């Protein structure tokens, strides 16, 4: 997911800009986004939310808007229990479990149900699970006493002022997410939100692992208020961003450092290349128009090529194998963009899968490691050129096997296919540095691949008066058998041809194709 918010001072027109850009599976129930527009005499909201949520999570209107990215807020603890004597060891004493016998029905192949017993055991920590290896684990989830998640989002997105928004956010009913805000008044905000247990010791990695479950020493009971969490408001940089990176570069220059917060809130791991691109795309550009803002969102730079190719190529041209030599020449002529017409891109991907592991996140191959001090220009270079060339050797094989050639056009293998609509792909993996994201599948036997995850709802909003907004939904606004509204946006996506989002009543009337009057009485 990406999120930008730009302060008035950083724009040509003097109004704030907002990017909504969640990345989720294209093919998963509860992750499907839906676009809607709600208008009463007292509030207005437009945008997208996961199906079955009655409130819009990616909302905007004439006054304000928000967006969300995943932050991994560690809001649960898994505890390893020491089983002994029918109970579990805890503070030197064997202590018994709470047990209840519940049941559920299971549907059988023949349409009947059988009745199935289900013991539910709990320790002090929470409900207990046995892993396939025998480890008894108790899970302790923060914020089970926060019933107002839905109403909090509703109050945030219909906030009349930043103060009202902030008061709503401060109720701590939304247990996770980075949340970014912008408004027509000129305020922009980043908050690393969620419900975080207060802990007296241990870093994030300790708390993500199995915490020992034999001691009150590790049993937390309290959570952090909002002003204990990383936040940024109208920073001197004139923008805020998050691309799933740790909260330490939400703007440039930074307004805090990792030592200002408990160490278990968020990791201190290297920033993805997409996250690095996010910071530069914003910080390097002033006097932004909405048009230019939109063009920046399309960025699909193969940043990892920039970090590795200057070392890889000269090393590879030395190799005796003419096919390796030709691969190096193909790679060197590449402009390092993930365009449809790229003949080097697929090949580069395959080398990168070997150089940085299958998810492109490994760091060991670089000569210069990622550093907090050069946080958008590290890691750099190739540590072992000879070894990397051998990786290119294997990658030439893999590219040919998968795709049929070392030089097949990117957008001939990479297709976006919904129903009978078949269009050329462009952009690619976030971890290679592509800002706009399409997480391409493994190819089929004809070397054709499709996005499994990536751009879903994309909207860009300028809080002028009236507001101006443009959006697309990759997989359409419906997924019911036979809808014409599933594959009717993807061609536009392939051309980056965004719809004007229609908020004002006169615009809505000009565009209406179906009127459903309804009447509700309780």
């Amino acid at each position: 997911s990406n999120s930008w918010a730009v302060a008035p001072g950083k724009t040509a027109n003097g109004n704030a800009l907002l990017l909504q850009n969640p990345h989720l599976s294209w093919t998963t129930d509860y992750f499907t986004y839906y676009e809607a527009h709600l208008v009463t005499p007292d509030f207005e909201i437009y945008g997208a939310t996961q199906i079955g949520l009655p409130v819009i999570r990616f909302a905007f209107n004439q006054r304000m808007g928000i967006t969300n990215t995943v932050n991994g807020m560690v809001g649960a603890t898994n505890y390893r229990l020491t089983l002994q004597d029918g109970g579990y060891l805890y503070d030197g004493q064997v202590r018994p479990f709470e047990r209840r016998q519940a049941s559920y029905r299971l549907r059988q192949a023949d349409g009947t149900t059988v009745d199935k017993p289900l013991e539910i055991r709990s320790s002090v920590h929470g409900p207990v699970f046995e892993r396939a290896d025998g480890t008894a684990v108790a899970v302790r989830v923060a914020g089970l006493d926060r019933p107002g998640m839905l109403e909090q989002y509703f109050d945030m997105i219909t906030a009349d002022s930043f103060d009202d928004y902030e008061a709503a956010l401060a109720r701590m009913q939304v247990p996770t997410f980075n949340i970014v805000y912008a408004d027509r008044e000129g305020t922009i905000n980043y908050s690393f939100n969620g419900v975080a247990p207060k802990r007296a010791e241990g870093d994030i990695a300790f708390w993500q692992g199995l915490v020992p479950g034999d001691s009150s020493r590790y049993l937390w009971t309290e959570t952090h208020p909002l002003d204990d969490l990383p936040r940024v408001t109208n920073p001197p940089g004139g923008f805020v961003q998050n691309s799933n990176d740790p909260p330490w570069t939400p703007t440039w220059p930074v307004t805090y450092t990792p030592k200002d917060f408990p160490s278990y809130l968020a990791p201190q791991t290297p920033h993805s290349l997409r996250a690095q691109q996010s910071v530069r795309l914003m910080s390097e550009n002033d006097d932004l128009t909405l048009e230019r803002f939109m063009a920046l969102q399309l960025s699909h730079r193969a940043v990892m090529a920039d970090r590795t190719l200057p070392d890889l190529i000269p090393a590879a041209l030395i190799d005796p194998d003419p096919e390796v030599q030709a691969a190096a020449r193909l790679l060197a002529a590449w402009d390092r963009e993930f365009t449809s017409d790229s003949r080097a891109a697929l090949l580069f991907e395959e080398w990168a899968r070997l150089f940085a592991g299958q998810n492109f996140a490994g760091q060991a191959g670089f000569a210069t490691p990622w550093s907090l001090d050069k946080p958008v220009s590290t890691p750099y270079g190739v540590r072992d050129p000879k070894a990397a060339v051998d990786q290119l050797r294997t990658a030439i094989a893999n590219t040919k096997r998968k795709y049929g050639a070392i030089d097949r056009p990117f957008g001939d293998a990479s297709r976006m296919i919904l129903n009978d609509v078949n269009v050329p792909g462009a952009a690619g993996y976030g971890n290679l540095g592509s800002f706009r994201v399409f997480t391409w599948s493994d190819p089929d036997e004809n070397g054709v691949r499709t996005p499994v995850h990536g751009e879903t709802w994309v909207a860009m909003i300028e809080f002028s008066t009236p507001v101006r907004a443009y959006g697309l939904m990759s997989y359409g606004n419906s997924r019911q058998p036979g809808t014409t509204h599933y594959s009717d946006q993807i061609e536009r996506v392939s051309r980056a041809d965004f719809r004007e989002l229609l908020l004002r009543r006169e615009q809505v009337e000009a565009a209406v194709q179906e009127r459903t009057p309804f009447n509700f009485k309780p």
Partner: protein, 158 residues
């Protein structure tokens, strides 16, 4: 200071759908708009929504069998369907009416358009405010925050 443009005052309850199937929902008050919204979501996504709500009652295994059983076991064991009932009762009365309206809209779409509802999610109906609360509760706390994979010691591919 420069005020935003005038709000629109809906004088009747209607959904104006555009060419891409985006519902513009106009209600004369909050519960109307929420009803309209549940209607629209059921039009556009009824099958999966109903399936998901059925799961969040912890009835996956009962409605749809073994492929739904592990989520059933995960959610019953974490007392999700019952906490949803509690959370529902604990809503402010104004917001509880919005959730009831949303469930009503879903139900009313399925009523006026039974042909649009896949046979094996029919048994789920009617849905309630608590259903809506439950699904949101599985989504936030038991998919995002505490995934079954992190606890059971698993997780999904790339």
């Amino acid at each position: 200071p420069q005020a935003p443009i005038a709000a629109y005052k809906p004088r009747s309850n209607e959904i104006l759908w555009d060419g891409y199937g985006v519902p513009h929902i106009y209600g004369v008050d909050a519960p109307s708009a929420f009803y309209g919204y549940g209607w629209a979501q059921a039009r556009s996504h009824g099958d999966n929504i109903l399936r998901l709500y059925g799961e969040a009652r912890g009835k996956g295994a009962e409605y749809w069998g073994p492929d739904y059983e592990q989520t059933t076991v995960w959610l019953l064991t974490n007392g999700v369907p019952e906490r949803a009932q509690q959370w529902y009762a604990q809503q402010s009365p104004d917001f509880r009416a919005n959730l009831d309206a949303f469930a009503a809209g879903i139900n009313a779409y399925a009523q006026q358009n039974p042909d649009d509802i896949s046979p094996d999610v029919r048994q789920v109906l009617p849905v309630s405010g608590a259903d809506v609360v439950a699904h949101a509760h599985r989504l936030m706390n038991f998919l995002y925050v505490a995934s079954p994979g992190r606890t059971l010691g698993e997780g999904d591919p790339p």
